[PDB]
Design a protein around this ligand. Structure first.
Ligand SMILES: CC(=O)SCCNC(=O)CCNC(=O)[C@H](O)C(C)(C)COP(=O)(O)OP(=O)(O)OC[C@H]1O[C@@H](n2cnc3c(N)ncnc32)[C@H](O)[C@@H]1OP(=O)(O)O
Ligand SMILES: CC(=O)SCCNC(=O)CCNC(=O)[C@H](O)C(C)(C)COP(=O)(O)OP(=O)(O)OC[C@H]1O[C@@H](n2cnc3c(N)ncnc32)[C@H](O)[C@@H]1OP(=O)(O)O
Ligand SMILES: CC(=O)SCCNC(=O)CCNC(=O)[C@H](O)C(C)(C)COP(=O)(O)OP(=O)(O)OC[C@H]1O[C@@H](n2cnc3c(N)ncnc32)[C@H](O)[C@@H]1OP(=O)(O)O
Lengths: 274, 272, 272
């Protein structure tokens, strides 16, 4: 699976040399195998692409005088920023992620675990939000690591009944969840991958919320457990957004219609009854 | 006291070389001095025991075609994983921990602070769960780091009132808490070491739960603060489980009883 | 803006060589350029100031025999610790922070973002507490990173509506929040920078609490969202504390009056 950095280095390296700003790691070396690289000393964006290893390597770079001429993504990137935004679609462990969407390591691990089908565009997920699935709940044991003691036949028995379990432990026998576009998810939020298949477009998940069921489009959910406090817009307004899908507009189209995006009232007058 | 890695190496190294997968740190080099170690390049389990420094290094190692012949614990381990599961009973800062039981740094720190008496077998604690004790609440101040300014005279009367406080600030004057076997603790959960002395066997603690009270065996508790939602099993089943104690079974009898472990109804017909 | 380390070295280094304990990073090498430094081998507090890079490095250092003659802050410090306590008033991204006050990376970021005006003395903030502001809620979109696509003119009208917004998205058009002295903030707590301007002196914010409005002095708030459960003291006691301000006492005054700090009744009798 290509990392975020590999996907960008593909796009933008264009025959340049990779300049590693920071102490390299094993994961970074494996990612830099197809490319030629050296430690960063003097760097010129015309000959070098700067890879900061950690986020603290990046702010050291950005506080250096040579960062003056480097553009984000085009000329530099952070390796330890797998959830960082990009202005184009990318793949996070083969999970599609739309433009201008970012998240933290709890969501990265969820993509790796297969819990996520897709993440949409213009979606903002706090770095401490978490997504996990339930263990089996209708067996004599609740442990998962006990399966490290199962031989092949016991494991087979065990896997057979996990797949028939209608509560979807470890997200078995359910569709991976789709996180919509223009979604907001707050700090320390939790989403149960065993019971959630959908976070609708425009949904807001407040800080500390424990999400155990699907979140309808443009609903605001808070609490432990999370419940709908309100919707961002009227039911007539939501139907309109889901039809227009401004999050699919081009960059040109976004700027030319910024008004309708800044003013929900004007959006409704223009696109409601067309 | 001995770190998790040292207990594993003493048991499984078997005269091999330690092959370090990742950038070695000061703490790792100190723990590796009694042994022979080198940076990992080409490794074979007949001659090398692979130690991944960070969990980032481990996933890179498991991505290497060389890792296929390496079995967990017996042939490789992560150093930045003091709470990671082991197939044998271990110690975590003088705290007994059962087989196939894992937890995060929040719980490792709790063992180091003396908050935990023991942790059972086959217990699953999410990495973000926290265990902490309360600051003092019967004083003019709640700060703890103000004591960095206390001389020994002030330190003495401060320590004095703490240990008499019936609300057990910093878990003073109370027994450390036992965490049972087959326990599940969810993400961002919190357990108050001032007020909790037992998490019973089989208890489930939900994500985001704030646990201020002992949790009975096989109770499911959720919420802020945590309340008992339901129990996993009937009363008679719970008694049977507390008598049978399948979590003390050997590896073979766990496999022999996989049908009873999978189906609670078959468990009762057999053992009830 | 000076890092925490820079502020400590300026105050305590006193012509000694900086001895680096751990793998040095790019950020650290830059911070150490105005000073003479080398990798730590053998160290003597008479001639060396030890800088541990990570908290892991510091654990190794304090377990080494060479450390037992070293005093915290005066002779050693961790570089990976901008939220760590200091015995003197410091700045964190030009936010004033009182003595013996500590917090985690979530609060360091809030200082960097401009969400915090000041943090008082002897205040204890758990490492998993978080402080953030709201996105705009009066527009068709909630995203913030859409503005990366806004051309020059679209950016202008976007920022103009942000500034006139009474719910203060991104903490616009509001005062940064003041966190008081003798404050306690628990694990996984959250404070909303868009609606909160004051955490009063002596306030207690429980574990898991979601704080959406101002916390009065010496109030105890818990829950999701946080609600006032009780106050630490009587109203007249609270007014006396806010007038006396023991948290600004000198070190000598704290030790001389330790019995009043340990006994609330003695405090009220002496200062009420
Ligand atoms: C992408 C990133 O990195 S995000 C960075 C970190 N930022 C955050 O976590 C911000 C989280 N924001 C929130 O939680 C906000 O409250 C949001 C998104 C729900 C917006 O709140 P707004 O509605 O202003 O809140 P306002 O108080 O009107 O809300 C009204 C009701 O919702 C409740 N509410 C709001 N948030 C929560 C919450 N997180 N938990 C419980 N209740 C909440 C309020 O208490 C209030 O209840 P009351 O009138 O019902 O008694
Ligand atoms: C060690 C690790 O691997 S941790 C990995 C990280 N994973 C997690 O943290 C997931 C944690 N999981 C949980 O918290 C689960 O939801 C568990 C185990 C309690 C689930 O219990 P279940 O039996 O599925 O409950 P089921 O969904 O029917 O719902 C029961 C009730 O509990 C509520 N509930 C479930 N979990 C929570 C929770 N975490 N907080 C509040 N309420 C909860 C449900 O809303 C429902 O309420 P109701 O019955 O009042 O309507
Ligand atoms: C760096 C650090 O700060 S270390 C962090 C690790 N430790 C923590 O975060 C522990 C934080 N401490 C707490 O949460 C404590 O409960 C405190 C200090 C906030 C208050 O505890 P106390 O004053 O002893 O309250 P005591 O348990 O009687 O409970 C009083 C009421 O508050 C409620 N309560 C206590 N804690 C919480 C909580 N965390 N969340 C919601 N309610 C709570 C109790 O349920 C009780 O309710 P009741 O009146 O209905 O019975």
């Amino acid at each position: 699976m290509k990392t975020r950095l590999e996907q960008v280095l593909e796009r933008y390296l264009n025959g340049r040399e990779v300049a590693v700003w920071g102490v390299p790691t094993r994961r970074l070396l494996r990612a830099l195998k197809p490319f030629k690289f050296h430690t960063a000393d003097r760097v010129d964006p015309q000959y070098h692409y700067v890879v900061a290893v950690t986020d603290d390597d990046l702010t050291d770079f950005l506080s250096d005088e040579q960062s003056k001429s480097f553009q984000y993504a085009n000329d530099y990137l952070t390796f330890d920023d797998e959830g960082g935004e990009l202005p184009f679609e990318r793949m996070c462990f083969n999970v599609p992620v739309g433009r201008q969407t970012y998240f933290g390591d709890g969501v990265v691990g969820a993509c790796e675990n297969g819990y996520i089908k897709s993440i949409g565009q213009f979606t903002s997920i706090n770095g401490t939000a978490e997504i996990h699935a339930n263990h089996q709940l209708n067996m004599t044991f609740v442990s998962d690591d006990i399966q490290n003691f199962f031989n092949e036949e016991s494991m087979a028995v065990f896997q057979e009944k996990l797949r028939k379990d209608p509560k979807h432990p470890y997200a078995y026998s359910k569709e991976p969840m789709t996180i919509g576009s223009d979604v907001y998810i707050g700090a320390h939020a939790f989403i149960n991958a065993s019971t959630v298949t959908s976070i609708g477009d425009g949904a807001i998940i407040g800080s500390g919320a424990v999400v155990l069921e699907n979140v309808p489009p443009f609903a605001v959910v808070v609490g432990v457990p999370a419940r709908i406090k309100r919707y961002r817009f009227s039911k007539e307004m939501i139907e309109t957004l889901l039809r227009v899908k401004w999050w699919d507009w081009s960059i040109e189209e976004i700027n030319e219609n910024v008004d309708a995006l800044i003013s929900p009232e004007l959006f409704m007058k223009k696109y409601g009854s067309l």
